[PDB]
Amino acid sequence: EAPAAVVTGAAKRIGRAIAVKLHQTGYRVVIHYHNSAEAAVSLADELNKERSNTAVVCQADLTNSNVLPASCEEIINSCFRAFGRCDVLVNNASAFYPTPLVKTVETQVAELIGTNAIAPFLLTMSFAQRQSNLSIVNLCDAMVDQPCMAFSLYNMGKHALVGLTQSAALELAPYGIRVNGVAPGVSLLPVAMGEEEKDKWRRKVPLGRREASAEQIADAVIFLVSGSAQYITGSIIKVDGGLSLVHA
Amino acid sequence: EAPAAVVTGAAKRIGRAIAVKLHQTGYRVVIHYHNSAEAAVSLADELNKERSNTAVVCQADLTNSNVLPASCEEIINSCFRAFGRCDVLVNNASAFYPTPLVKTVETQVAELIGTNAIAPFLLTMSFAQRQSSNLSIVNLCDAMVDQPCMAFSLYNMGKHALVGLTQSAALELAPYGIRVNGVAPGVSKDKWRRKVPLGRREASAEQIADAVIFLVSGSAQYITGSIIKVDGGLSLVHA
Amino acid sequence: EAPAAVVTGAAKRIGRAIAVKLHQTGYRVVIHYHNSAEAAVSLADELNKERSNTAVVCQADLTNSNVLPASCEEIINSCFRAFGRCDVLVNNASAFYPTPLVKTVETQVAELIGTNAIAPFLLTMSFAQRQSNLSIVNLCDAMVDQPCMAFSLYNMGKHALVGLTQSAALELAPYGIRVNGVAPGVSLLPVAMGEEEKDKWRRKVPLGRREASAEQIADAVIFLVSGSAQYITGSIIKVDGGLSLVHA
Amino acid sequence: EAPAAVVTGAAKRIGRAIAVKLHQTGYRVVIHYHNSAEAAVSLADELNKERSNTAVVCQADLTNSNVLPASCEEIINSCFRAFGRCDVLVNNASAFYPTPLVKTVETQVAELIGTNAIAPFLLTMSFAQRQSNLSIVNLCDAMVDQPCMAFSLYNMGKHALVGLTQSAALELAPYGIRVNGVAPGVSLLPVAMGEEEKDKWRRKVPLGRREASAEQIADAVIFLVSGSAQYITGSIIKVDGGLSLVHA
Ligand SMILES: NC(=O)c1ccc[n+]([C@@H]2O[C@H](COP(=O)([O-])OP(=O)(O)OC[C@H]3O[C@@H](n4cnc5c(N)ncnc54)[C@H](OP(=O)(O)O)[C@@H]3O)[C@@H](O)[C@H]2O)c1
Ligand SMILES: NC(=O)c1ccc[n+]([C@@H]2O[C@H](COP(=O)([O-])OP(=O)(O)OC[C@H]3O[C@@H](n4cnc5c(N)ncnc54)[C@H](OP(=O)(O)O)[C@@H]3O)[C@@H](O)[C@H]2O)c1
Ligand SMILES: NC(=O)c1ccc[n+]([C@@H]2O[C@H](COP(=O)([O-])OP(=O)(O)OC[C@H]3O[C@@H](n4cnc5c(N)ncnc54)[C@H](OP(=O)(O)O)[C@@H]3O)[C@@H](O)[C@H]2O)c1
Ligand SMILES: NC(=O)c1ccc[n+]([C@@H]2O[C@H](COP(=O)([O-])OP(=O)(O)OC[C@H]3O[C@@H](n4cnc5c(N)ncnc54)[C@H](OP(=O)(O)O)[C@@H]3O)[C@@H](O)[C@H]2O)c1
Ligand SMILES: NC1=N[C@@H](c2ccc([N+](=O)[O-])cc2)N(c2ccc(Cl)c(Cl)c2)C(N)=N1
Secondary structure, three states, X not given: OOOEEEEOOOOOHHHHHHHHHHHHHOOEEEEEEXXXXXXXXXXXXXXXXXXXXXXXXXXXXXXOOOOHXXXXXXXXXXXXXXXXXXXEEEEOOOOOOOOOOOOOHHHHHHHHHHHHHHHHHHHHHHHHHHOOOEEEEEXXXXXXXXXXXXXXXXXXXXXXXXXXXXXXXXXXXHHOEEEEEEEEOOOOOOOOOOHHHHHHHHOOOOOOOOOOOHHHHHHHXXXXXXXXXXXXXXXXXXXXXXXXXXXX | OOOEEEEOOOOOHHHXXXXXXXXXXXXXXXXXXXXXXHHHHHHHHHHHHHOOOOEEEEEOOOOOOOOHHHHHHHHHHHHHHHHOOOOEEEXXXXXXXXXXXXXXXXXXXXXXXXXHHHHHHHHHHHHHHOOOOOEEEEEEOOOOOOOOOOOOHHHHHHHHHHHHHXXXXXXXXXXXXXXXXXXXXXXXXXXXXXXXXXXXXXXXXXXXXXXXXXXXOHHHOOOOOOEEEEOOOHHHOOO | OOOEEEEOOOOOHHHHXXXXXXXXXXXXXXXXXXXXXHHHHHHHHHHHHXXXXXXXXXXXXOOOOOOHHHHHHHHHHHHHHHHOOOOEEEXXXXXXXXXXXXXXXXXXXXXXXXXXHHHHHHHHHHHHHOOOOEEEEEEOOOOOOOOOOOOHHHHHHHHHHHHHHHHHHHHHHHHOEEEEEEEEOOEOOOOOXXXXXXXXXXXXXXXXXXXXXXXXXXXXXXXHHOHHHOOOOOOEEXXXXXXXXXXX | OOOEEEEOOOOOHXXXXXHHHXXXXXXXXXXXXXXXXXXXXXXXXXXXXXXXXXXXXXXXXXXXXXXXXXXXXXXXXXXXXXXXXXXXXXXXOOOOOOOOOOOOHHHHHHHHHHHHHHHHHHHHHHHHXXXXXXXXXXXXXXXXXXXXXXXXXXXXXXXXXXXXXXXXXXXXXXXXXXXXXXXXXXXXXXXXXXXXXXXXXXXXXXXXXXXXXXXXXXXXXXXXXXXXXXXXXXXXXXXXXXXXXXXX
């Protein structure tokens, strides 16, 4: 059989491009989504028209809560119920917004630490418990050590995720499960953000003065789950066009 | 008058050494304690014999809950009530235990992420909100963050998150004159002692406290976003 | 129309596996060597048997000295003379031996800092001066923050190479030249090392209790030079089986 | 009697503030200088005025060459000749100038890698070979991972100095010698810089929008050599007012 992958937050943007590229590489995919129900089903539609019975969707809120363990368990079970196996997990889903030090605070903690770190941890536990080229890829952030002003909790979540990547690589290595991260710099800039602000960011990037395409991010995920990365674990590949090297 | 410090988890071990040493330097201190009332009060007793009314205790569970925010605001308020000011926050309290990937898990999260990272973040917000002054926060980090103990995932995540906080907070609070730094102990088992380059022994708590003292001093007035390792070289030793 | 690559120290072990895998991907190769003439020629003969006129050898000492600049310029020149172009430089050649703080020391400096850091810098200058998927890959070391006892100069050269990787990424990005590193852990243990000591090192590797093959290192090099790594620069991929995550 | 320290490049700016504060703290000091003969001699005068026989000068070029080991050996020898002991080495001397990838190149290598890295290594070997609270402090660079463009060789020298810090910390620990670093951001801007340009660097510094005074860098050095730092070795304290945290 074809291997199977779970991609969290795969309805739009980078997670979609990852799901598509794994699909094109011959994976069956679980497309997880939270709110983007239309975009999820439609993507699964396109993929199933390319090969029947090779994409399903799965809805879950990945905010931290006393039911988060069961939703993460459920995401993983969805892959085994659809495909009989689960080879790859890509932790892509992520909340992003300011939490100035100077939504209630408990809800921000719940969404920014929950989605960025606790859900990846619970998903990793269930993926491991339900188990060959097994691997987990976490989408980290190339700018973790030069953070955006007023994004403390997002930054805390992404650092926690680097910690999980290292801890899990070490603890799951004996079972043959590799864990690695991909750390984008600036990739798809929200059309939400304006055009002048968009160009401000583009100008900062050494390699081409442009943001990464979603495809460029997905290419590095594909390498890490590939047979070419069989000895790579605990590694985080930056895909940032040199942005993390530029001083203030 | 004299500056004032909050130290979390101050009843015992490293938090105690920090509270004593800040007190010897002339700080008034809040000794925060969860379960250790007797030890906290005994220490406040000792400090107030040295100088009257320079040490109060403050009870709070720093588990993450819907009440954590209120608990953290109260720790900071304790200091302003007792002393009229709060110059230093030392985020020392911390839960430590394994969480194998292969207590409910959500209880482990509330303690290992709540105590180690979320309470520091909420205390930092309260400290800053409530503000020749010398304001600083010092976070107790871990020198072994990049070579973690097997099966210590959540703890390791919490300490990494604390490093992120240290950096984000240093950047955001710098305009307010508040410095934010970290101290990362190693071992502070003869297996362990023997691995340590510098003299085959664990640090004393007092050696941890010495680095804290430096970071709060006027000798460290340009330092922020820095994490001083106090590990006797342990993190440099390969497998 | 085939691109061309220089691999330094290409006659044996990891540099040989890199040259072979670049060749297999369609590159013409300069096989640089120092002392290993027979192994170098024999590799070029094999590659040229596969595809005529696709491999040449180039002899040079990469120790630091007043002639090192001209040697490095000639290595690069040899690629343009043989193939009309030079698209990839792999800085793989490296001396390694102890230098206790407690050969003259200046020869040890010349060899450990020259081969490991200064020759890379001079090659990178020549490569960029003589200039499309252009990229340089430096072979770094995953254990650079937990160094071997009494290897100060080696460790200094490898840290200097990290700095070069970062500096040259930033400065060559505007010319579209990407610069990245591959940091092995333990790979291809010396055939001469007694099996009981090899075992000590293998035992420490979480992923599989085995050293990497040379080909596993080469796989990461192939990724970085490929069209899939087009937005990656200033990155260093560790290929170490999780060894740098293991505490003492 | 009083402990003794060597400070390299101590005639002016940061190394002077370090020699002063060491002396204020009770040390006898060797003020190493290269060209700054007037300033060196003047400083030792001020110090000896305050406590007789507590300061000597020692001239040396710290460029890499086949005589660099003898000069480093002599700097340390001068301390033993003047004071009978040598407790502290501060590696502060350093060249800094552009070396664009696109003075011969071999002279740049000798000065930028020699002063920043090789001389510290050789000084370290001499210090250790010649041997209460023994310690070495290397002056590193907070910006080493976000380098100034066109400063490759300087950046390579500073990264090498970090490696030396760690390698020597590990190797010299069993002899009771601690090795640590202090990494300034921007400190004491030169008067040879435009109002415009000084304000450019100043505006970036989060903590007070101002460079460090030399005194602020010396303060950290004092701490690492003090008995309050007896368990600290292998550590590098950034003294940069937050500058390394600021993104592009
Ligand atoms: N984009 C960049 O330039 C960049 C830079 C650095 C790092 N990254 C990392 O790369 C990854 C993908 O980036 P992106 O820009 O594609 O991210 P994105 O568009 O912000 O969001 C990814 C998905 O996360 C899901 N999500 C958000 N909150 C959730 C919750 N409470 N429960 C469940 N799912 C939730 C959303 O799914 P629904 O739409 O179904 O609600 C969303 O589609 C992220 O991990 C990000 O932090 C990206
Ligand atoms: N000791 C080491 O070798 C070492 C190594 C690496 C890092 N560190 C870091 O150094 C710091 C101090 O270490 P230590 O060994 O002194 O730590 P510790 O003895 O385990 O604990 C510090 C204090 O934290 C408090 N604490 C724990 N859970 C709490 C909760 N849910 N609510 C409120 N308070 C809670 C406890 O207070 P009560 O007793 O009042 O209940 C405890 O006495 C920690 O941040 C730690 O991770 C230490
Ligand atoms: N193998 C590992 O586990 C490992 C671990 C960490 C890092 N690395 C890095 O990976 C790269 C490849 O490693 P390896 O184990 O294959 O290395 P290797 O066997 O030690 O040697 C690489 C080649 O370097 C060339 N070389 C050495 N000194 C030279 C000089 N003065 N001038 C010119 N060339 C010289 C030699 O060419 P000739 O044979 O023709 O004389 C040698 O065969 C190196 O940069 C190494 O530091 C390897
Ligand atoms: N200032 C900053 O903002 C900053 C930022 C990052 C790092 N640093 C580091 O902190 C340390 C001191 O900084 P600084 O700005 O005071 O540096 P500085 O003014 O540039 O120079 C320090 C001294 O090193 C000596 N030196 C230069 N070339 C030499 C050679 N060939 N032989 C012997 N000595 C030589 C010079 O001595 P003579 O004058 O006697 O010739 C010079 O006074 C340096 O290691 C520097 O890299 C400083
Ligand atoms: N340049 C370089 N060379 C190799 C190396 C050292 C010794 C031998 N040997 O004796 O055959 C081979 C490679 N090397 C290395 C060092 C230790 C080990 Cl265990 C291995 Cl596999 C390679 C390294 N890091 N750099």
